[PDB]
Design a protein around this ligand. Structure first.
Ligand SMILES: *[C@@H]1O[C@H](CO)[C@@H](O[C@@H]2O[C@H](CO)[C@@H](O)[C@H](O)[C@H]2NC(C)=O)[C@H](O)[C@H]1NC(C)=O
Ligand SMILES: C[C@]12CC[C@H]3c4ccc(OS(=O)(=O)O)cc4CC[C@@H]3[C@@H]1CCC2=O
Ligand SMILES: *[C@@H]1O[C@H](CO)[C@@H](O)[C@H](O)[C@H]1NC(C)=O
Length: 560
């Protein structure tokens, strides 16, 4: 009889997952467009959790479940509104808007402060918090209703089946995300034949608002069927944290999730700054190749735990095994890397021959000297030598071909290598793409990501199964609830934040905002991005592994 409820919940789970990706696939765009640092784009990303942590508290004191289906419905409806709200800042903000050649010819010749636009991110941040306030009722209350209507061995298995179908969402999310990150932000408003920036450039902000509008409409449509369907605490918390093992595990999980959440939030920016790949490719490769294998990994983990008869002391050893395997593959990321992009004036002297300690305050070279011009304009042009430059004026170029589609500057004062004197010094817009070898290494990156995430998923269910055998039977609901709350809150709100702070400390060139304020990051120090990204994710992981080993030792003792 209750097939209706299951269908509806599946729609909702598909909707929930679609929502989460639409947020993490638009990070590279929202950040790029509202012009905020990586830290805030982490804050905005976390606000979703921030809302989740809010709704929890409000129900805990002065709230409770009542008529589950209508509640799930109002939750999904609020999630959809929130998606629509998050898309809304685009319709009342304005158009998302340097080719100046050398001006040796001419030499020695308030509103921005009051920029509400500067706190316009506060809109998206709110919308995401709405989404968080609305999503929370889905999972726990849906599982409660299931367990209310379930025969022997049904509610839990139902979680499994629903989780499987949910994996159809990330597939569409990334697929749609790959489609809308190729469409310029003002698509339909501006004639797309004049926009010079390309999807590979670092100023390209794709249609994120389409992502959010589609996610919101899907969420509302999935909220529709839920209507017309049905017709002390602290004391235990004390105990749950009194059990040393539980504490070890929650800490163990928190460490890994923070390594997962940071990596997910900034994987698109890492793909783009290390290898030359845009966001559209990354999105679709994660959606077509990685997600089916991730679902296969989750299924295989469940089956391995269900068939091989792995007990408590054994399930922990198996999950640790998955981790050693995942970490091994992750630690391989450090051998499939790529040299730094030589951005004259940022990683080297302007003459392109001497490398310097600081990106900041690099003295102008003869070539980039008399040509006085801005020093905060990121209009990158790469020359025949293959070294990126900052701006056509900072490269000392004199003449331009014109607004014709291929814009090739000439007579550039820099690029004064003596080996190409007979050759020209033309430099076309954009940065120059990385050598083929790096594009090749991108595929090793995708393969290592696939294998890592497969071995990660292999231990997915094991986490829930363990969090229930490490704790006394009468504390389970509270123990798993506190686990989920700690993981979501801490990992979700803090990890996108400090990962972005450290990625910020790796940034080389920032862009002026409306009124003289660090805006967004135009180019990064790839190698440092790695040591701060791949590095913080590895230590968090290694530390998780280290505690597991300790946990296994202890479990091997407690039961023996
Ligand atoms: C780029 O430099 C070339 C070579 O100097 C310029 O071509 C010469 O321009 C000047 C003035 O017209 C004269 O030397 C000759 O008429 C041109 N022939 C050459 C090769 O000497 C060219 O005009 C410059 N283009 C700009 C404005 O960037
Ligand atoms: C598998 C996933 C899509 C992308 C995933 C990912 C991708 C790269 C990544 O970092 S990477 O260095 O391993 O590539 C971390 C993660 C963490 C989990 C994250 C999602 C969970 C649900 C989902 O559909
Ligand atoms: C330099 O540019 C000229 C056009 O001005 C082009 O004909 C030439 O092939 C380029 N390089 C060489 C080999 O001189």
């Amino acid at each position: 009889g209750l097939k209706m409820f299951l269908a509806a919940l599946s729609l909702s789970f598909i909707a929930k997952t679609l929502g989460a990706i639409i947020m993490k696939s638009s990070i590279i765009h929202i950040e790029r467009r509202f012009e905020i640092s990586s830290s805030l784009v982490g804050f905005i990303d976390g606000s979703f959790e921030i809302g989740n942590l809010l709704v929890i508290v409000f129900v805990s004191y002065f709230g409770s479940k009542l008529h589950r289906p209508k509640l799930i419905g109002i939750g999904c409806f609020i999630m959809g509104i929130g998606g629509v709200l998050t898309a809304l800042p685009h319709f009342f903000m304005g158009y998302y808007r340097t080719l100046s050649t050398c001006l040796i010819n001419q030499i020695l010749s308030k509103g921005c402060l009051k920029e509400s636009g500067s706190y316009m991110w506060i809109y998206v941040f709110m919308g995401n918090m709405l989404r968080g306030i609305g999503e929370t009722p889905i999972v726990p209350l849906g599982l409660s209703y299931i367990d209310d209507f379930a025969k022997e061995g049904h509610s839990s298995l139902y979680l499994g089946i629903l989780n499987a179908i949910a994996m159809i969402g990330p597939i569409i999310g990334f697929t749609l995300g790959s489609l809308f990150s190729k469409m310029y932000v003002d698509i339909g408003y501006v004639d797309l034949s004049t926009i010079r920036i390309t999807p590979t450039d670092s100023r390209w902000v794709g249609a994120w608002w389409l992502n959010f509008l589609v996610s919101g409409l899907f969420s509302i449509i999935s909220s529709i069927p839920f209507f017309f369907l049905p017709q002390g605490f602290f004391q235990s918390f004390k105990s749950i944290l009194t059990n040393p093992l539980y504490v070890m595990f929650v800490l163990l999980t928190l460490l890994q999730v923070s390594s997962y959440i940071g990596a997910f939030t900034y994987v698109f920016k890492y793909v783009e700054q290390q290898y030359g790949q845009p966001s559209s490719k990354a999105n679709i490769l994660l959606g077509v190749i990685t997600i089916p294998i991730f679902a296969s990994g989750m299924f295989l983990g469940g089956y391995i735990i269900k068939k091989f008869k792995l007990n408590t002391v054994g399930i922990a050893k198996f999950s640790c095994f998955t981790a050693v395997m995942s970490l091994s593959f992750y630690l391989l990321y450090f051998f499939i890397l790529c040299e730094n992009k030589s951005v004259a004036g940022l990683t080297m002297t302007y003459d392109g021959n001497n490398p310097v300690t600081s990106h900041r305050d690099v003295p102008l070279s003869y070539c980039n000297s008399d040509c006085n011009c801005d020093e905060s304009q990121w209009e990158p042009v790469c020359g025949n030598n293959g070294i990126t430059y900052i701006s056509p004026c900072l490269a000392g170029c004199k003449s331009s071909s014109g607004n014709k589609k291929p814009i090739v500057f000439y007579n550039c004062s820099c690029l004064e290598v003596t080996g190409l004197q007979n050759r020209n010094y033309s430099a076309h817009l954009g940065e120059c793409p990385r050598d083929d070898a790096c594009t090749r290494k991108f595929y090793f990156f995708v393969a290592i990501q696939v294998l890592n995430l497969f071995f990660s998923a292999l231990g997915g269910t094991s986490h829930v199964m363990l969090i229930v055998k490490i704790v006394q039977p009468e504390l389970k609901s509270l123990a798993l609830g506190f686990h989920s709350m700690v993981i979501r809150a801490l990992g979700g709100i803090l990890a996108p934040i400090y990962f972005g702070a450290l990625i910020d400390t790796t940034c080389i060139k920032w862009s002026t905002n409306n009124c003289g304020t660090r805006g967004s990051c135009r180019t990064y120090n790839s190698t440092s991005f790695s040591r701060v990204y791949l590095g913080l994710s590895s230590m968090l992981r290694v530390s998780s592994l280290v505690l597991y080993i300790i946990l296994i030792y202890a479990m091997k003792k407690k039961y023996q």
